[PDB]
Design a protein around this ligand. Structure first.
Ligand SMILES: Cc1ccc(CC(=O)NC[C@@H]2CCCO2)cc1
Length: 460
């Protein structure tokens, strides 16, 4: 029975509005409704992994698991296995997988982050799950960010706290946050970004939604505009939105948006918005294709509609050779030529690199680089031909060309990372000097760049 090189992943996000779900929620898991929807011919084909994020979830874990499993069994005639479930307040993540994957899944981690301080600590934050699927690391984050049209900067701060403090994946990757720890990272939830148009325009917005004309609304969506200005979700992807705003509906129909200020809303307007979103970030040159992104039309217990997204994702096998794991394969090596880091820092410490990868027995520290002043004020750290030769555990090109090297640039004075990035080994050639590049981030914000050349030697 061969190991897969692709799987499909279902991502769901639903703010349930503290109400129990209706009897039938299968449309969610079938990717049926508005937007980029799934073909009817696929309805019986189970996804490999289902990741369900809820917010304002009033159910017990047991109650929700029974609904989810019975839903999937009705669609697919498969009894899914529970990989993980984690709840913070009313924010919940459930991971289900096909039974045939039970012995492919390992290193399961869960964690949560509470956002805010005092007043603003007690219901917003995030839950997450990570695991290995054979040779591939997967991370999943469900966040419920701060509400209200005038709080986009708070949402952006919530995002930065969650990616700094959520403790998922390989703890040995100590310089790296969740935005670098996984082959594929999916981040979804009630992100709560709004369509920033004047309150007076509410009926105009409703008109536009009825005409399925979303362009003038999406051009004011706070998540798209903040992402374009590099304020949040740097280096994440989102599929184009082709479904109506998923908030704020009158319950028990989808015919009416309830936007007017009420005591129940703290006298705030809730103009129709795309609160409910799915984004992802995968390592460079790994296959990931979004195959659906949309909302349901027939699940009306909440003031939000459920959102679905599905993905094809490349996966790799748990590789064994005669040599590694448990030794190196002298027939493999990774060399770096003419490398330099460009950093936005004002500081003047020396810097060194760390190279982390599951193709190495352990991480590798470089010598300190040579600081020069760049022509436009920047710090340039030169490594020249000084970087250590990396010794992979396995030399087979079928394994090595699928790997990635994480890079941290660290201060010699504090050993703190000033920037993190990732290089793919999926090269156009072996035994050939080829340009490499990554942006560098710290706490998910841009801090610099790393560029140079690589020379990869495989057994072929
Ligand atoms: C209109 C707009 C443009 C950019 C972004 C951020 C982003 O990461 N987009 C993914 C790629 C990256 C290169 C351009 O598109 C959001 C919204």
């Amino acid at each position: 029975q061969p190991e897969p090189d692709m799987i499909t992943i279902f991502i769901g996000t639903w703010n349930m509005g503290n109400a129990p779900p209706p009897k039938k929620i299968t449309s969610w898991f079938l990717s049926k409704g508005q937007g980029k929807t799934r073909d009817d011919s696929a309805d019986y084909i189970p996804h490999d992994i289902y990741v369900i994020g809820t917010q304002e979830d009033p159910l017990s874990e047991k109650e929700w698991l029974e609904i989810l499993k019975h839903s999937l069994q009705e669609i697919t005639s498969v009894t899914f296995k529970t990989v993980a479930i984690h709840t913070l307040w009313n924010i919940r993540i459930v991971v289900l997988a096909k039974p045939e994957h039970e012995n492919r899944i390992s290193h399961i981690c869960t964690d949560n982050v509470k956002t805010g301080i005092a007043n603003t600590l007690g219901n917003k934050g995030a839950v997450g799950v990570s695991f290995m699927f054979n040779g591939t690391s997967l991370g999943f984050v469900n966040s419920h960010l701060t509400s209200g049209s005038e709080k986009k900067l708070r949402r952006n701060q919530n995002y930065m706290n969650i990616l700094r403090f959520l403790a998922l994946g390989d703890k040995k990757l100590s310089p790296f946050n969740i935005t670098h720890r996984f082959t594929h990272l999916f981040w979804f939830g009630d992100l709560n970004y709004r369509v920033d148009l004047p309150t007076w325009e509410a009926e105009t917005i409703i008109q536009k939604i009825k005409q399925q004309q979303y362009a003038d609304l999406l051009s004011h969506d706070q998540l798209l505009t903040e992402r374009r200005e590099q304020k949040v979700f740097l280096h994440f992807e989102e599929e184009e939105i082709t479904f109506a705003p998923t908030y704020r509906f009158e319950r028990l129909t989808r015919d009416k948006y309830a936007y007017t200020k009420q005591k129940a809303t703290g006298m705030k307007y809730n103009l129709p918005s795309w609160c409910d979103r799915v984004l992802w970030k995968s390592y460079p040159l790994v296959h990931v294709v979004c195959q659906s992104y949309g909302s349901t039309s027939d699940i009306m217990t909440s003031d939000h509609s459920p959102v679905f997204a599905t993905f094809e994702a490349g996966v790799t096998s748990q590789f064994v050779s005669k040599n590694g794991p448990g030794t190196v394969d002298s027939q493999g090596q990774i060399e770096f030529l003419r490398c330099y880091a460009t950093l936005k820092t004002k500081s003047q410490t020396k810097f060194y690199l760390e190279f982390h990868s599951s193709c190495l027995e352990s991480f590798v520290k470089s010598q300190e680089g040579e600081n020069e002043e760049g022509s436009e004020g920047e710090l340039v750290v030169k490594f020249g031909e000084t970087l250590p030769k990396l010794k992979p555990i396995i030399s087979d090109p079928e394994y090595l060309l699928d790997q990635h090297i994480l890079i941290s640039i660290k201060s010699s004075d504090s050993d703190e990372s000033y920037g993190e990035g990732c290089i793919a080994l999926r090269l156009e050639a072996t035994e050939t000097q080829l340009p490499i590049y990554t942006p560098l981030t710290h706490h998910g914000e841009l801090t610099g760049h790393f560029q140079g050349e690589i020379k990869l030697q495989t057994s072929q």
